[PDB]
Design a protein around this nucleic acid. Structure first.
Ligand SMILES: [Cl-]
Ligand code: NA
Ligand code: NA
Ligand code: NA
Ligand code: NA
Lengths: 216, 460
DNA sequence: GGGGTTTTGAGG
DNA sequence: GGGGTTTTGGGG
DNA sequence: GGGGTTTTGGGG
């Protein structure tokens, strides 16, 4: 039994080809999470790991409406309750996004969240980046291994085996190693990208804009 | 400078004092706030190293050293227990019963590290020789001076350190927690275990397979750049770990930015006994092979003993730099780890062809013996950590006509169209090789632009 | 000090 | 000059 | 006081 709500949710998302409708329904309930940081990065925890929530322009306007005396960029060490949320996979540059791995990211799309101002939460272990967790990374790698292996078995065909005479009697034979390189898929670039999940799309606000919207 | 022994340093002077000591434990240097870094270590010497033995339990006694700095680069990185440290201008005080030396490196304090073994950890990793036995391999500030009179102190301390580590455990039982009782700890705890496997999870992270004396196996993540000294078969002491309640598939230890992985000097009695007592475990691997999806990595092969000391080369270097790098061009034999994405030919039955040594041609045995000597002509399409994100899969050959990799499958070549037993064993190997989290550790020899597997055998 | 950063959020 | 430190204004 | 530095006698 997975004690981390986030770990479980994101794991099922990946084990279900990024399809949020296939993830257990008994997991799409309101999320009460502790705010670890709010600026420059807004990170919330579930008691075990931290994740970065992506707020829609609608969600923030609704927030500022129901809670005029509350600035989001100042919710650090405070608790929030996300009543309406969704998850989706996105291709990113893990070299720049630390809340991602292997150029993949599972995003927590926030549509509506209430700030339970001054609610003291129970003591927990130090929160760790979910995209740095051994099992979770391995779950992502499983995801790509399945994508890759399917792509390869569709791309490579005909059994173009190196002629045995090339590796036999190779006394006066020289060759370039790159001759062993085989394209994995019909991808356009030098990066593998032949995945079946349909990359979710949804406009989200940059934590910097919400900072200016509350203090130019 | 006048050097004083740990047990004889004044607790009332409050004046800066200097000493040489042996480091038996330390945290990695870590950042506390926007302007401070700390490194806490435990030190011993001829006058302070063991508690009143009678009812003590041969427990190690020690002073503590806390070094403070404004920059990371200004604090010592202790990769190995047993080396020596020289400190200047430290103030001593009693902290909860024990002698605590404090030194603000950001002000007027300094340290210097000296190797107790021939080479320092970094030097052994790079296969370098030490300038001299009186040269510090690391130190604070821009300069370090060793006076003629110190040479005796340093030589004697080294002599003592070896006597100490070969005679006592140094890291006593009270200094760590048995892995099989790891889930009972409230917070963090130390470990002393043998490194059974170093799996390259990705471009920046190693996943260590630990086993300690209690026989429990745990995994933990080690950043390559932080702990470059991790090596299979070696015994380390892990400073500060915590049990992961969210890992359900495997037992995992979490480390922190201040945690540290520490090796022992050559004379260590504890490291010697553990390297022999703790034996490899494959229970985790065997169990995982029964599951459709294993979050535990499984190394399916073992290379001949004569190669166990050969350094590994990534596919990245083997296929993209082996024709442009001076060092890579000079070698014809290499060692490498990878996972198999596809195996050709598709029909396992054609893995074995008949070979004609005169015409150098192979053929299907579906027609039978009329093709010559039986041999394996298998083409593996593989990938690895260094080539994870690219759109390539690389070819690795198992062409045994000349003896290379003949016993890779532990199944002598044979007409797989007639020998059911052979075919079945190979078919099963096939599913294992292509299964997620299955990897191959192998030695390859470059021949006419291709790499053939040799001196490598499946151990499952 | 047996500890909690970040232009470093993949040494810190 | 400016830190850390305590010398709390002045050495070399 | 004493570093490293240049301020080369004096701030905080
Ligand atoms: Cl060649
Ligand atoms: Na002063
Ligand atoms: Na001064
Ligand atoms: Na001065
Ligand atoms: Na001066």
């Amino acid at each position: 039994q997975q004690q981390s709500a986030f770990k479980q949710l994101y794991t099922e998302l990946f084990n279900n080809e990024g399809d949020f409708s296939k993830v257990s329904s008994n997991l799409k309930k309101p999320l009460k999470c502790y705010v670890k940081e709010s600026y420059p990065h807004f990170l919330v925890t579930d008691g075990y790991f931290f994740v970065a929530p992506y707020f829609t322009k609608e969600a923030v306007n609704e927030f500022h409406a129901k809670f005029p005396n509350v600035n989001i960029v100042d919710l650090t060490d405070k608790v929030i309750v996300i009543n309406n949320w969704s998850l989706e996979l996105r291709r990113v540059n893990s070299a720049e996004v630390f809340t991602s791995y292997a150029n993949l990211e599972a995003r927590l799309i926030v549509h509506s969240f209430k700030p339970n101002l001054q609610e003291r939460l129970n003591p927990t272990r130090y929160p760790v980046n979910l995209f740095r967790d051994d099992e979770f990374k391995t779950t992502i790698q499983h995801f790509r291994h399945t994508a890759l292996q399917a792509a390869i078995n569709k791309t490579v065909k005909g059994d173009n085996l190196v002629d045995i005479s090339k590796v036999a009697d190779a006394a006066g034979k020289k060759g370039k190693v790159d001759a062993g390189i085989v394209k994995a898929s019909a991808s356009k670039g030098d990066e593998f990208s032949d995945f079946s999940f349909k990359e979710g799309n949804t406009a989200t606000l940059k934590i910097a804009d919400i900072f200016v919207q509350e203090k130019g | 400078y006048e050097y004083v022994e740990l047990a004889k340093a004044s607790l009332t002077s409050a004046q800066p004092q200097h000493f040489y000591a042996v480091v038996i434990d330390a945290t990695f240097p870590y950042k506390t706030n926007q302007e401070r870094y700390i490194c806490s270590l435990k030190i011993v010497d001829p006058t302070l190293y063991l508690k009143q033995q009678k009812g003590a339990g041969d427990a190690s006694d020690y002073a503590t050293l806390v070094l403070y700095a404004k920059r990371f680069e200004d604090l010592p990185i202790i990769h190995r227990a047993g080396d020596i440290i020289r400190v200047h201008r430290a103030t001593l005080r009693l902290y909860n019963g024990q002698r605590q030396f404090n030194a603000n490196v950001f002000y007027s304090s300094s340290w210097a590290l000296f190797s107790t073994d021939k080479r320092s950890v970094t030097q052994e990793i790079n296969n370098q020789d030490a300038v001299s036995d009186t040269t510090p391999f690391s130190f604070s500030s821009k300069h370090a001076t060793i006076e003629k009179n110190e040479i005796s102190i340093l030589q004697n301390l080294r002599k003592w350190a070896n006597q100490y580590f070969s005679s006592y455990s140094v890291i006593s039982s009270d200094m760590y927690t048995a892995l099989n009782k790891a889930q009972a700890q409230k917070g963090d705890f130390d470990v002393v275990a043998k490194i059974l496997q170093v799996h390259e999870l990705d471009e920046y992270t190693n996943e260590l397979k630990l086993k300690d004396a209690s026989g429990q196996v745990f995994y933990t993540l080690s950043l390559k750049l932080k702990f470059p000294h991790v090596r299979t078969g070696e015994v380390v002491r892990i400073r500060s770990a915590t049990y992961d309640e969210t890992s359900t598939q495997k037992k995992v230890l979490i480390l922190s930015h201040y945690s540290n992985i520490i090796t022992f000097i050559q004379s260590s009695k504890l490291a010697k006994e553990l390297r022999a007592k703790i034996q490899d475990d494959h229970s985790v691997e065997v169990a995982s092979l029964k599951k459709n999806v294993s979050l535990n990595a499984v190394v399916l092969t073992e290379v001949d003993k004569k190669h166990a000391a050969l350094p590994s080369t990534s596919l990245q270097d083997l296929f993209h730099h082996a024709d442009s790098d001076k060092e890579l061009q000079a070698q014809d034999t290499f060692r490498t780890q990878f996972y198999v994405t596809k195996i050709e030919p598709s029909d396992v039955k054609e893995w074995v062809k008949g070979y004609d040594r005169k015409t150098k041609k192979s053929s299907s045995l579906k027609g039978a013996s009329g093709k010559g000597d039986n041999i394996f002509q298998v083409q593996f399409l593989v990938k690895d950590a260094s080539t994870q994100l690219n759109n390539n899969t690389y070819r690795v050959l198992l062409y045994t006509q000349d003896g290379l990799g003949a016993n890779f499958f532990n199944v002598k070549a044979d007409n797989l169209h007639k020998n059911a037993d052979a075919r079945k064993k190979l078919e099963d190997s096939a599913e294992l090789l292509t299964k997620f989290n299955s990897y191959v550790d192998a030695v390859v020899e470059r021949r006419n632009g291709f790499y053939l597997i040799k001196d490598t055998k499946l151990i499952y």
